[PDB]
Amino acid sequence: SMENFQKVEKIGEGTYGVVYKARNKLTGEVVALKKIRLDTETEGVPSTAIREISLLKELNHPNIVKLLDVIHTENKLYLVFEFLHQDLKKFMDASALTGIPLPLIKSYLFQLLQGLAFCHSHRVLHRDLKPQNLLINTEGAIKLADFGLARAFGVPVRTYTHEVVTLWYRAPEILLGCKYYSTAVDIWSLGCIFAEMVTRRALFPGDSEIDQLFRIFRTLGTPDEVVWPGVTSMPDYKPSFPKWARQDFSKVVPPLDEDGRSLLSQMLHYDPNKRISAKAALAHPFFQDVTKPVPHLRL
Amino acid sequence: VPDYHEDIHTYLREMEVKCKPKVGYMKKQPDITNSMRAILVDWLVEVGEEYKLQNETLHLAVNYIDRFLSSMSVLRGKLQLVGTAAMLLASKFEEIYPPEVAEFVYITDDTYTKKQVLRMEHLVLKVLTFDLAAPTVNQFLTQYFLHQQPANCKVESLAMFLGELSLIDADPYLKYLPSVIAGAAFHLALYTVTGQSWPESLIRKTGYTLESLKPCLMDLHQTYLKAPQHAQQSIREKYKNSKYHGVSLLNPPETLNL
Ligand SMILES: *CCS(=O)(=O)c1ccc(Nc2nc(OCC3CCCCC3)c3nc[nH]c3n2)cc1
């Protein structure tokens, strides 16, 4: 089964399982192998694996990590993925002194929006976009990875799992306990990541749910009924919330040009209905000169 | 999410053809029949009520079962094991808090052991090659509901009721696609409650006309009229509940206009 794979080293542990770098001995292909223990569950095959595999088999796209094969045992399931070279978090740290060039930020954002638009068109929410889950290669590609928190949605949505998205990248409608959320939560995450590529620090690094909300409110203004109809009836809204004035976006991400600021602001719109779709975002004027540069990789 | 609405609809129309069971499969099962399958699906309806599972979960489980039995010959003693594993998988796919495996062993009355349930789970995954994100009648209905003017919750619950009755009887409903059953169910509910018909806007969306829905509609109308006599009754009981507006109490029409 695994006869043809040679393990090289461990990469990390995502939402579930463990990921190793390996190579195919017959073809030479370098792969990432995700090992999933079944004997640890005499609950059986975990729901995260069932979702990740069924959805990833449908999602074939150049900016979505490619599931090549699924290898069974009674005791282990191995997912074979295309191998990428590093995550965006590592790349951002490697760039600390020198900065990420704008062409490359633009290229990466454009590509991520293509991947996300594809997901959303195929009724999939990712629900865990963050730099650790965004993988780059030596050729200038970036791809969505770790679909262990993903799910298939219906139109219109119902109530889905609340305990969702890493805190720093979590949308206000989830923090306020809204009954329904949808594709707009992934765009929110991406907007936080766009700001983060530019500054090299997380836009809203909160330490709790209430700290997260207050950090968001200090940057974008405390939302009211005018900016976001229905906020004040949302389950975890408090009328005691401090009322902060909105910051002008040229202070939020000072290196960003007018087009960039416009795009970021539509991605961080409070009202999920008004928040820009990935599809619509691909046509924003920010991308009119987009290219695909190759990054400086220090593997 | 009106912006992806049409991309999603298109995509589900494509995938419903790929997840389609084999229409003739029961003829090739030496040991089980449509009547045994009806008994099983009816039992899954009860199980769904007992654990407060989503309707979507039930629809998915039945899809898994029909696809599995399209290629795997199964003795009657083992049909419930297949069904239990299918419901487990569906719950894991679809539910926020699925029942745990022990609960699934408990509702089979220890006919089967836990390791049997877990081993069937894995066989079902192998047989379906992990392709579990199947379109259902329920997923089409939900989209079709957005074309009401205005929403009528009796129409909605009655459509779900009819779509659910279609799950019980492999003959005739296995030959119709989910989008078509949803179409017939929505039209029949809408006409029963309001007197109105399959709207223009859905002809534009789906390409289905009343003409094209007619064969399914003729079957579904008969199922509705005979629902009180059917050997299986768990769907009629479920839909007496106020959560579904007691729609199983509404009188089916004596005839349809056509
Ligand atoms: C910190 C290690 S690294 O940045 O040098 C690095 C990261 C990723 C790869 N390749 C890779 N990795 C994964 O999944 C790894 C997990 C992803 C979620 C967070 C924990 C790690 C892949 N899945 C599919 N293809 C992958 N390629 C190499 C080096």
Numbering used by the authors:
A (entry chain A): 0 to 298
B (entry chain B): 175 to 432
What does the primary publication say about this deposited structure?
Cyclin-dependent kinases (CDKs) play significant roles in regulation of the eukaryotic cell cycle and in transcription. During G1 phase, CDK2 bound to cyclin E mediates phosphorylation of the retinoblastoma tumor suppressor protein (Rb), which results in activation of members of the E2F family of transcription factors, thereby assisting entry into S phase. Following degradation of cyclin E during late G1, CDK2 pairs with cyclin A to phosphorylate and inactivate E2F, resulting in S-phase progression. We present biochemical and structural studies that confirm 6-(cyclohexylmethoxy)-N-(4-(vinylsulfonyl)phenyl)-9H-purin-2-amine (NU6300) as the first example of an irreversible inhibitor of CDK2.
Guided by the structure of the CDK2/cyclin A/NU6102 complex (Davies et al., 2002), the nucleophilic residues that are suitably positioned to react with the vinyl sulfone of NU6300 are Asp86, Lys88, and Lys89. To confirm this conclusion, NU6300 was co-crystallized with CDK2/cyclin A and the structure was resolved to 2.4 Å resolution. As has been previously observed within this inhibitor series, the purine ring makes a triplet of conserved hydrogen bonds with the backbone amide and carbonyl groups of Glu81 and the backbone carbonyl of Leu83 within the CDK2 hinge. The aniline moiety adopts a similar pose to that previously observed in the CDK2/NU6102 co-complex, packing against CDK2 through a π-π interaction with the peptide backbone between Asn85 and Asp86, thus positioning one of the sulfone oxygens to interact with the side chain of Asp86 (Davies et al., 2002). As a result, the vinyl moiety can react with the side-chain ε-amino group of Lys89. In this region, the electron density map has continuous density between the side-chain amino group of Lys89 and the inhibitor’s vinyl sulfone, indicating the formation of a covalent bond between them. The structure of the CDK2/cyclin A/NU6300 complex reveals the inhibitor binding mode within the ATP binding site and confirms that the vinyl sulfone forms a covalent bond to the ε-amino group of Lys89. We identify the site of covalent modification as Lys89, a residue that lies just outside the CDK2 ATP binding cleft and is not well conserved across the protein kinase family. However, the CDK2K88E mutant and wild-type CDK2 did not. These results prove that Lys89 is the preferred site of modification by NU6300. Furthermore, this structure suggests how the reactive moiety could be grafted onto other CDK2-selective pharmacophores to develop inhibitors that specifically target CDK2.
